[PDB]
Swiss-Prot record:
Family: Belongs to the nuclear hormone receptor family. NR1 subfamily.
Domain of life: Eukaryota
GO cellular component entries: chromatin; nucleoplasm; nucleus
The protein's role, per its UniProt record: Ligand-activated transcription factor key mediator of energy metabolism in adipose tissues. Receptor that binds peroxisome proliferators such as hypolipidemic drugs and fatty acids. Has a preference for poly-unsaturated fatty acids, such as gamma-linoleic acid and eicosapentanoic acid. Once activated by a ligand, the receptor binds to promoter elements of target genes. Regulates the peroxisomal beta-oxidation pathway of fatty acids. Functions as transcription activator for the acyl-CoA oxidase gene. Decreases expression of NPC1L1 once activated by a ligand.
UniProt name for this protein: Peroxisome proliferator-activated receptor delta
Gene that produces this protein: PPARD
UniProt KW keywords: Activator, DNA-binding, Metal-binding, Nucleus, Receptor, Transcription, Transcription regulation, Ubl conjugation, Zinc, Zinc-finger
One of the protein's GO biological processes: positive regulation of fatty acid oxidation
Localization: Nucleus
Main subcellular localisation: nucleus
Quaternary data: Heterodimer with the retinoid X receptor. Interacts (via domain NR LBD) with CRY1 and CRY2 in a ligand-dependent manner.
Tissue: Ubiquitous with maximal levels in placenta and skeletal muscle.
Description of post-translational modifications: 'Lys-48'-linked polyubiquitinated; leading to proteasomal degradation. Deubiquitinated and stabilized by OTUD3.
Full protein stretch here: 170 to 440 of 441
Gene source species: Homo sapiens (Human)
Residue intervals of the NR LBD domain: 42-270
């Protein structure tokens, strides 16, 4: 009985995912591997190719809309911020497309997004990453990991840990239908500080995890220990976000000319 009900539940979460996210892992891997396309991403690996990309690639966020130019490393940070905020927007609409999330009081919705979106962002980020770099500008660009390493501290340091996480996460070979459930479980988390209706959120979280376990039995029948591996990745994401927030505090303290987006300020306020 419940195996069948949870299958339906999972399909509605997958549909929420397909409706709301700009890029799927399926599309991202087809770009990263070269698989079937008349166009290849422009590679950004140094200052000259960065300038050419700002001149010539199509950006969701127009360069003139970014804060005033300071230097190369900050400019990259500002592009990172733009994408982070765009993904918060997508995660919010994904969450709101899940009925049991929308049925929560709005203040609990905000609490879940506040403490869950970065975890979800760093999980979804793996979809566009390989060991050598990541996709940018809706897949029309590829920024090398080596170039990102060459940025000055603190900006290079806040980037590299996410690659380290992503390469290990991608070795589990999740597809979009697995990720939709994984991300929903990250957002619908009963552990978040200040939740008003903890039992309700705990119950939803449990349903999603049961759906995930069963989804993996069907979709990855040969993969041993995959469900417990993913619970551990959820734990790992919490630690990755703690470190990230600590690094952001140092950027706020020491990089005083760097602007932080007001929405992210609200997210870090009580972290
Ligand atoms: C010319 O254009 C470019 C040049 C060079 C790099 C880029 C670029 C590179 C990476 C992204 C990106 O997709 N992201 C950012 C990202 C990716 C990996 C590691 C870290 C990281 O952000 C850390 C800072 C986050 C601050 C916000 C905060 O939380 O307060 C995804 C997370 C969203 C977009 C754009 C564009
Ligand atoms: C203000 C300092 C920080 C500026 C750098 C980040 C700007 O990002 C963009 O800002 C818009 C304003 O909300 C969002 O709507 C977009 O989704 C987001 O991509
Ligand atoms: C359902 C609409 C009416 C909601 C009214 C309740 C608002 O509560 C506020 O929720 C915020 C998180 O969302 C917390 O950060 C605040 O501390 C808390 O005061
Ligand atoms: C778009 C969803 C992303 C959530 C954005 C981050 C939430 O910020 C919080 O908003 C609450 C008001 O609602 C305040 O009470 C809190 O002090 C503040 O930390």
């Amino acid at each position: 009985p419940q195996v069948a009900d949870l299958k339906a539940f999972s399909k509605h979460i997958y549909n929420a995912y397909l409706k709301n996210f700009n890029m799927t892992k399926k599309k991202a891997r087809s770009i990263l591997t070269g698989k079937a396309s008349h166009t290849a991403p422009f590679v950004i690996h140094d200052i000259e190719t960065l300038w050419q990309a700002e001149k010539g690639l199509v950006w969701k966020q127009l360069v003139n809309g970014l804060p005033p130019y300071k230097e190369i490393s900050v400019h990259v940070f500002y592009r990172c911020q733009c994408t982070t905020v765009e993904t918060v927007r997508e995660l919010t609409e994904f969450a709101k497309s899940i009925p049991s999330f929308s049925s929560l009081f709005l203040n609990d919705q905000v609490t879940l997004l506040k403490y869950g979106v970065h975890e979800a962002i760093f999980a979804m980020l793996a979809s566009i990453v390989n060991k050598d770099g990541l996709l940018v500008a809706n897949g029309s660009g590829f920024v090398t990991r080596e170039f990102l390493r060459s940025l000055r501290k603190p900006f290079s340091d806040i980037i590299e840990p996410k690659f380290e996480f992503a390469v290990k996460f991608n070795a589990l070979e999740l597809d979009d239908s697995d990720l939709a459930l994984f991300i929903a479980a990250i957002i619908l988390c009963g552990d978040r500080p200040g939740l008003m209706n903890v039992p309700r959120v705990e119950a939803i979280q449990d349903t999603i995890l049961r759906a995930l376990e069963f989804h993996l039995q069907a979709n990855h029948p040969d993969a041993q220990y995959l469900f417990p591996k993913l619970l551990q990745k959820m734990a790992d994401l919490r630690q990755l976000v703690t470190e990230h927030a600590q690094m952001m505090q140092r950027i706020k303290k020491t990089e005083t000319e760097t602007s932080l987006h007001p929405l992210l300020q609200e997210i870090y306020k009580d972290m």
